[PDB]
Every structure is written in structure tokens, then in C-alpha cells.
Design a binder for this molecule. Structure first.
Ligand SMILES: C[C@H](CCC(=O)O)[C@H]1CC[C@H]2[C@@H]3[C@H](O)C[C@@H]4C[C@H](O)CC[C@]4(C)[C@H]3CC[C@]12C
Ligand SMILES: C[C@H](CCC(=O)O)[C@H]1CC[C@H]2[C@@H]3[C@H](O)C[C@@H]4C[C@H](O)CC[C@]4(C)[C@H]3CC[C@]12C
Ligand SMILES: C[C@H](CCC(=O)O)[C@H]1CC[C@H]2[C@@H]3[C@H](O)C[C@@H]4C[C@H](O)CC[C@]4(C)[C@H]3CC[C@]12C
Lengths: 316, 315, 315, 315
């Protein structure tokens, strides 16, 4: 998986992700309207106060999101964090206790600013409990973003709960976020500027085409390598103007780092690949997506009809 | 630039390219209909035998294509070949002489099968002449494909005129095609299959995520590196079924090897990037494309209306 | 810098390092004999319990070692750890306080087995103080080894004092040791076994020579890259028999990952390179070394003469 | 294999090679004195006129060299060139016909200047014949050097006989020399100068140690990769002064690109590795070498005794 966020010149946020997996899970776009029942395992039951949109699965009326974006421009995506993610055995007295799957709607229902999320997370405890005993707990970490900033939330056996500022605007998979940040220093030799003709003891050695400054940029799907390339692309992509251009910029970056079917076979013999790419545009409250087997950009929107519906809206 | 072709389970061809450039050319989609005027510099002027679709510019009613696909399923794309491409000073007696830009319509108008193109090219000479004196000659090489096979055409100072079979179904830029084919042998260590946990003198060393078998696959835009990656992706991508899935597969591969804006700055100070990606589906006679600043898949079709028009149709 | 250890089939230890620097320090081989004065900043002054050999400089009769090996087969090497190393502001009550430079002789004078060093380090505090005001404190981390095991000692602002088991038998420079161990999982695609001929959609793609399984092994001098290569080489080098063969194995590995003069220019404009490579053989109590400008293997030995001298012996 | 040459500040040549193999050939240092019998398969028999030194095997009194250096400062090394090397089925009328193994002594006995070798090779034909029926013909290519220049000699099925100027001073294995020269342009992003701290959208991204400018330099033993690294190291290594420093520089470079035992396992299951490294100093007429299992620098010399001996001198 790869998460990505950036803004245009006017503070309009474009934020979304690739889902990289070994099979399709039957997921689809879900709009959860305002005032929808919202039960919690450890907090009081309530209702949604903000409409949200994103990709996921409905389990007994509960929209279980892989990524989720609210009508006020704040979103969260859960990405795989294997060999690291570990949540608490039960609830802890005094904390805001969330079963880990509940973070998606807890963040999107209760906040519009990442600065407020970061403060509240200081007293949050994520619990190792699924929606019901039939389900496995997903070993996730999360990227959360508004138009001003993005944070990473990781809860691991190694380090406990950590919250990081993410000025790069990207996230992939394991290892932990500080490891990846540290890894970037090993790629300071990258430069968008082309090399020029050289004399190696009088032998003319000159580029054959453009791109020579990025020698050493990895193109494989190892999470550390996708992190380096996604960060490098995001920080060097110019700011662009308008909805079409920013959505296109978003898909240009995420499709560059997509996991291409047939190029990765996991140890169990299945192809791992980017099953979908999705972008939420806060300015238009529109969720854009395409799939490995259908490249057409589909659009779904939070508007006066969908935000005020009396049931979940699901698209398949 | 990257050119790409493959087929589905039933011989339906998907063939197209990324156009990677550092300046604007004002290109757009052009349909050239049947029976349309077709002048040649060194051959008799004639009319089109069949309809074609592709991306290009119109110069005095002449559709000058960057990539061209005919209604019978045969296409050609011209890609940059700097430091290598060199054409003849003038026409040569006894040869079928084409100004280099004329190869696009000569191939697509006169043939259906690459095997026939390959035989005809034995007597073709490409000439260093532009469409008119206001244009420079583009230093190109070409990929030509039907549903059965693809060939590369290169005319260089180094090697003269060469025609290669291209079972990889890809082409990028310089150096020459045999150099790239030879380079692939240095990447035989690539393996789609993930590594598994290992013991390094008793230290458990294990993958953190999937993808470890392709260690060393380059992700930069140097032509040799995009060639390796595009070839690796194309030959390992499963065959898929149906128009939507094959078009999606095509864009999945080409967007993976696209030149991303801001990541390449040429020696003149300008960004080099993939300005458009295009796919021609022979089965539906449809040209699909999107652009760096507009990701929506646009479609243009050779149909009973467009193939029989009286003028060029430009979008 | 790169530190390296391994044993032969008989438990004979070979342990040493490359010194990679941008300026020379005038170092040379020093033997410190038994019963030699040994002052400490924060502990009682004493005399040496054991003879030691290694590379260093002498400061007012004190041998300040870059790497140090005792007559009982235990050694230590200090390697650069910039942007991480941080020692305490003065001594701390209730700890065994050592100025960081004193760790070299504290380890080699007081112990034979790493297991005892590891336990003793639980009560050690390293202090940010140099031997005298003429010297800065070097930002180091250390590898310590006997014939059974090796440990890494790191004291950082980020993590405090950490002691790690080092089954790989290698160390380089920054970042921290756990970062490097974690990085190895990203190189599990490395395989000593050559690839073989492949069919890329019918194009025969075959190796041109041996080595194809290690595609992606980095050859630059960035510390993380030398760590990967040094670890990979050490764990895959077979065990070899006898003194000459093991010393040769040792130099073969460290010269492979040497920092070659002219290939690295630091931000202050100076060449950084491997100024010397050194190997201590515990079995023969012999220190072997060569230098960037003199490749002859020089040898120096702890023996009944040198171990019992009344002064430092310098070469 | 890797071949390497360079000079000091005064035109003194240092020239030699790594021998990287996957079996034992029984090689040793051979001095062939003046006036030694020199039979030819397709030329009149003669005797040696110049003493030579190098590594090789003796076959029924004939010194068959892997590398060979004459007393006048001109040398030649034969390196593997598999999947390319192809010699003629028999002798060709009008040419100077040499069985391929005979080039070693033909070059070193008849010339002192590469410029003269280059001219003479215009009429040389290499023949696919071994010294006797118990040996296979080795698929080699050659680097020949004097103090002024080096040339590469390749005879392939692909290209026939080609002779290249080698300003890089290096050679490895397949593919052909022009392919490798062309490959270097893909590595122009290499820079010995370290990167410095950067701001990635306000995230401070800074090097952890020196070496960052050579990101992408390959460290594996694939011939194309060793060619890039050896060329990069040779052209960036400063010119150094004096015999000791130049021999050291030479071994520093070749040991950096050595094939390390255990890191390469061929398709037959055998370790491929650098079995020896050797350097000929023309100024001292001295052949320096060491071995995978014995790192001591051994020295063998052409002097008034060895050059005038009555039989081969073997070590
Ligand atoms: C259920 C197993 C957990 C196994 C484990 O802990 O080893 C998880 C391993 C990878 C996870 C998936 C992977 O993280 C990608 C998706 C992320 C999304 O936020 C949840 C659904 C996901 C589709 C998710 C569902 C749970 C699995 C499939
Ligand atoms: C629906 C698929 C199974 C598909 C199949 O039949 O193979 C399930 C496999 C793993 C489950 C997910 C996994 O258990 C993690 C989450 C658990 C949570 O309680 C519900 C949503 C979850 C995100 C959940 C949603 C349903 C999937 C994605
Ligand atoms: C080689 C590295 C750091 C230099 C570098 O890698 O750039 C260090 C490893 C051992 C250190 C030396 C060793 O600790 C002994 C001396 C200690 C003193 O405080 C500083 C100078 C010293 C003489 C010091 C200088 C820096 C080196 C030589």
C-alpha cells in the first residue's frame, strides 16, 4: 500500500491511497450519512455527526473503512503494518479505548483538524479486538491528514504508540515510520537535474537520454523502496492548479509506485498488486477511484442528497 | 517515451505509448479517413487506402503522427532516438525513398501484417528531410506491431538501417535496440517470487513486506532503466480477458514507467515528463488516452462515420 | 570504517577493521606490555593486567587506541558514529564512569570473555571527556569480540546506551545498529547462486557472466550499503583452514568494502578513504596491517619479549 | 576477471589483473628467458627475443600465459569473453595466423609499442585451435598496454575482429567492449562529491555518512557492474608517486572489485572467485601477486639472472 497527500496553491487537499493486496476482498465505495448509528465497544454508542466517504466493507450495518474522508476535509487511511502492529489485550482504565477498527470513524466523526487529533491521541488506547469474534484483527498503521498537515499513527510491539508528523505526505508498509525517515538520508544523492557529458580520462561519457540524476532510485515494490520513490516524487512534483490537474497529479504519482500484477508473487503463490487507487478531493467532496481491471476514473460525491440519506449508500 | 504492445487470450492487440517530452507540441487526436489525399516527397502522390487514428499535428492538411494505427489492426509509434538516428542526405536511386516523417502513413496505409512490412522495408531508404523548411527532422526510431509480432526500425550513423524482432513488446529511447536486448541479461537475477526468511549466521533476516525478489529493478527514467522495467512488467503481466481489463492492464504498465513531472529536469532547465499515455485497441478500433493534467480516459473511434469522412477529424 | 570478525573451524578468531578517514592522525602500531601504568579519569589509577596490541597514538605515555586486542583473545574497535554518539555530561554517581576513550583499555585490560564484558557494561557510564584539552571527543561506537561472540556498544542521544549481539560479525557507521539489522530484510533477494537462461515471451535472456544472483548489492561507500555488503560477504564466505588462509579471507572481505581514494570527497573537500586495514589473529597473537600507500602486509606480535617490556613499544 | 592499467607522474606503467575462476588451473609465475624455444602452429618456429614474466601453466615446455609482460614494458592479459569469443576454423591465406593461445607470446616477443601492435593486428587472424587436443580453446579477449596507451582486442561471432582504444584502463568480461563503453553513459549521475542536507518539503533529509554521491554504484560481480565500478575507480583515483604507492593503489582498486569467495556460485555449483591479483611494474620489471588463500605480496623479477637463464623459471 501507498498513502499520498498534497495540496494545491489554494489549500485544497488531495489525499488517498493504493490498496496493494493478494486478492480482492469485495470492497466498494460506502457513503455513511449524517446521523447514522455508530456503536462503540468501549465508548458510549452514538450517531455519526459528519458524512464520510471511502472504500470498505459493511459488516452487520457497520461501515468498516479501508480509508475514510469526512465532509470537513479530514481523512484517514489504514495501511498494512505487518511484523510490527500490536494492540492492547484489553481496555485500559482512564484511556479513550478503541478497538483498532474503530479508529476510522472515531477520527472522522470527532475532528476537523489534525492538530486536534494529535492532542486527543495522547489519551487513546487501541485494543486488539475485531468487530466480532469471527474476524481477524488487521495489523494496520494509519496516515491522517487535513489541508495543513499529516500524521502517522503506529502502535507496535517494538515501540508502543507513536505519532509522527509526516511532511513528506506519504506512507507505505513496514518497518516503522522513523526507520523510513532515517532511510531517506541514504538517498540524498538523488537529483532531478540531469547529469551532463563527462570526460573519464579522456573517454567521452555522456547521457543517452534524460533522467540520469536519479540513478539509484529503486523501482521494485519492497515497502522501503516505494517509500523512497513516493516521497521523492511527492516533494519534487510542482504545485498544480485546478481540480482536474491535481487529481491527475495524484494518480500520476500513485500509479508510478503501484504494485504491478505479475511482478510480485508472495510466498503463498498469489500475485500481489494494486487492486485500486483512490483520491479524495476535499474541495469537491469527491472520491475518485479506479481498479486494476477497469481504468476508468469513477466518481462518488458527498452532496446534499448523499450526506442526508437515512441508510448507508454502497456502490459496487 | 515508452512503447508497449501485448495481446489478450484471443489475439486482440493493445498497443500504444507514453509521450515523454520537455516542451509543448500542440498535439491532438487525428482521424485520417479513407480516400484522403496523401502526398509523398519522393513517391507518387495518392489517396489513403484505409482509415487511421492516432496523436499528431496537422501541417497544411497533412496529418503528421507521433503514433498511428490503422483500421486493420497495424500500428506504428515514433520515439526519440537521440545521438543515434541519422537519415540519408537525399533520396537514393532504386530505393523506396521516404522522408523520415512519412514512415508513419507509409506503414499504416500500405500493410496489415508486420511480416509484409518487414519484407518491404528491405528496399526502403529514410531521408533527412522535414515536412517543410520550418520544421527540423526528428531523430526518431519506431516500433511497429500487429497482433502477431512487433518490429523495431532503427536507422543510425552507427549501424545503418536495422530491423529487429521485438518479442518483449517494448521500446524506449537510446541507445540502440540490440544494446538494450543485451542489457537484459544483466537483470536475470530479477524474480517476481518473494524471498523468504533467512539465517545470516544465526541472525534471522526476513522480508518486511512483499516485493523482495525484484531487488535491483531500477525506478528512474534513464531510457535503459525504463526499458528493463517495462520489459519485465510486460512479460510477467498475466494475460487478461476483455476490453476493459486489457486497457487497464495497458495503462497500469505504462503509468508505472511514466516520467513523473518534477523528477526530471533537462540540461536546459525544463521538466521532462509523460504528457500523455495512449492505447489503441484493435478489437474496438478505439484510441484511449489521458494526459498529465487530466486523468480521465478519453476515447476516440474509427467507425462507419469517422472512417468515411471527407476531411481530417481533429480533437 | 568497517569492523569484521569470524572464526575458523577450530575457534581461532580473526578480528579487525578498516580505518576510513579524511585526514591522517599519525597513528601506528603500539604494544602495551603487562604492568604498565594505566591512569583513569574517574576510577583509581592502576597498572595493566594484560598485554595489548593495536593501532593508535601515544599521548603523554598513554596509548590511545583506535582498535585494541589483548593477549587473551578479546578485542575492541572504535568506529565513527556521527549524528548519534552522545556521552554523558560528566560522571554519574553509582556507575563505573569512563571517559569514552578509556573504553578501549577498560575492556581489554579487565576481561577475557564478551559474556563478562556484557554483564559489566550494565553498570558503565561513558562520559563526554577527552584525554586532555588538546583533543576533541570522538563520536564513536564500538564492536567487541572474542572467539564465541561479538557485541556492539552504542550510546546515543536517540536511544541511550544499547548493547547488541552481532551474529553478522560486522559494523560500519551511522545510523544505529538496529536500523542496519532491520535494513538487511530489504536485501533478502540477494542470492549467491547465479541466475540461468530465461524466456521473456520467447526472447532468450541469459546471463553474460557469473554474479547475476547478487543483483542490487550496493557498491558505494554509504555506511548502510557497506554494512549490507560486509554482512553478506562475511556470512557467505566459507570457513577456511589455517593462519594464512584466514588472514587472507579477512583482507579479501575488508578490501572488497574499502573506501577507495578519489571515489569519496566529503563536504569539506577532502578525500575520504581506507587509510589502513588491520587483522588480529588471536591464535598467533599477531596484528597484521597494510596501508593505502603501502600494500605489504606488516606483522607485529605479542610474545615473551614484547608482553614483558618496561615501556610502550611503538612501530 | 578484471584488467587494470595506469601510470604514475613519470610514465611508469602499473598493469595487471584479477583472475576470477571456478576451478583450479594449476597456475604459477613463469619467467621465460631470452632465446627460449618458441614454436608456432602456423608460423615458422623461432626463439624468444625478449624476456617475459607472468602467470600461466607450462605445457610440454611451452609457457602458456594468462597474463604476460615483456622486459620492454609492454604486456597483455587474456580475460574470459564467453558467449562472444569466436576464432576462425582454420588458418586464412595471406594473414598472420595465430592459434588464439599464441597471441600472448606473439605480442610480447615482437613489439614494444601498442601503436605498432595495433598496426600489425590489421593482418592477424586468430584460429580456433588449442595447444593440443587435451585442451579446449579458451573463449578470451585481451587487454594490451604500454606506458602510453591500452587497446582491447576482441574477435566475436557478432562483430569479427575489433581493436579498441581503452582510455579507461580497465576490462572485464562479456559483453563486448563497445557495449560497456556505451553503458557508462547510464552512470553519469555518479559523483565522488558527497551530497549535503536537503529539505524535502521541510523534512530535514541529510546524509548519515560519507559516500552519498555514488548512489547507484553496483557492488555485485556481474561483468557489466565490475566494469562500471573499476572504470569509475580508476579514473577518479589520484596519480600517486613512487613504486610502493602505485603498487598499493593498483591492489586497492583490484581488491575493491574482486569476486569474493562464497558470494558467487555458478550453475555447476562451484564457487567463482578472485584466485589471484597481480601487478606488473614496468619501472622495476617486477611482478607482484597475492592469492585468495595467502595475502602476502610476493615479488618476482626480470633481472640479469632470470632474463638470461637457460630454462623456464617457475614458481
Ligand atoms: C487478516 C490478516 C491478518 C493476518 C496477521 O495478523 O498476520 C490481514 C493481513 C493483511 C490485511 C489487509 C491489508 O492490511 C490491506 C487492507 C487494509 C485495510 O485498512 C483493512 C483491510 C485490508 C484488506 C487488510 C485486512 C486484514 C488482512 C488481510
Ligand atoms: C471480506 C473479506 C474476506 C473475503 C473472502 O471471502 O475471501 C474479509 C477478510 C479480512 C476482513 C477484514 C479484517 O478482518 C479486518 C477488519 C476487521 C473488522 O472487525 C471488520 C472490518 C475488517 C476490515 C474486515 C472486513 C472483511 C475482510 C476484508
Ligand atoms: C576514524 C574515526 C573518525 C574519523 C572519521 O571516520 O572521519 C575515529 C576512530 C578512532 C578515533 C581516534 C581515537 O578515538 C583516539 C583519539 C581520541 C581523541 O579523543 C580524538 C583523536 C583520536 C586520535 C580519535 C580520532 C578519530 C578516530 C581516528
Amino acid at each position: 500500500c501507498t498513502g499520498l497527500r498534497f495540496t494545491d496553491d489554494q489549500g485544497n487537499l488531495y489525499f488517498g491511497r493504493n490498496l496493494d493486496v493478494g486478492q480482492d476482498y469485495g470492497e466498494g465505495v460506502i457513503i455513511t450519512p449524517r446521523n447514522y448509528p455508530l456503536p462503540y465497544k468501549f465508548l458510549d454508542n452514538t450517531t455519526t455527526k459528519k458524512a464520510v466517504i471511502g472504500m470498505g466493507i459493511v459488516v452487520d450495518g457497520y461501515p468498516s473503512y479501508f480509508d475514510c474522508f469526512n465532509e470537513d476535509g479530514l481523512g484517514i487511511a489504514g495501511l498494512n503494518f505487518p511484523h510490527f502492529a500490536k494492540f492492547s489485550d484489553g481496555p485500559i482504565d482512564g484511556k479513550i479505548n478503541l478497538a483498532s477498527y474503530e479508529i476510522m470513524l472515531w477520527v472522522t466523526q470527532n475532528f476537523t483538524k489534525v492538530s486536534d487529533v494529535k492532542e486527543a491521541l495522547k489519551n487513546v488506547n487501541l485494543v486488539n479486538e475485531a468487530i466480532n469474534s469471527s474476524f481477524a484483527v488487521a495489523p494496520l498503521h494509519w496516515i491522517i491528514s487535513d489541508k495543513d498537515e499529516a500524521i502517522i499513527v503506529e502502535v507496535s510491539k517494538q515501540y508502543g504508540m507513536k505519532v509522527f508528523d509526516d511532511k513528506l505526505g506519504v506512507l507505505t508498509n513496514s518497518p516503522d515510520f522513523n526507520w523510513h525517515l532515517t532511510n531517506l538520508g541514504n538517498y540524498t544523492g538523488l537529483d532531478p537535474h540531469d547529469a551532463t557529458a563527462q570526460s573519464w580520462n579522456g573517454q567521452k561519457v555522456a547521457p543517452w537520454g534524460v533522467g540520469t540524476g536519479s540513478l539509484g532510485l529503486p523501482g521494485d515494490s519492497i515497502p522501503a523502496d516505494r517509500f523512497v520513490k513516493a516521497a521523492y516524487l511527492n516533494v519534487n512534483y510542482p504545485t498544480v492548479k485546478g481540480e482536474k490537474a491535481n487529481v491527475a497529479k495524484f494518480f500520476n504519482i500513485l500509479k508510478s509506485v503501484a504494485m504491478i500484477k505479475g511482478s510480485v508473487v508472495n510466498k503463498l503463490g498469489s500475485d500481489e498488486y494494486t487492486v485500486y487507487t483512490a483520491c479524495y478531493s476535499a474541495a469537491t467532496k469527491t472520491y475518485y477511484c479506479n481498479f486494476e481491471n477497469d481504468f476508468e476514473l469513477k466518481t462518488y460525491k458527498l452532496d446534499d442528497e448523499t450526506m442526508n440519506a437515512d441508510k448507508l449508500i454502497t456502490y459496487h
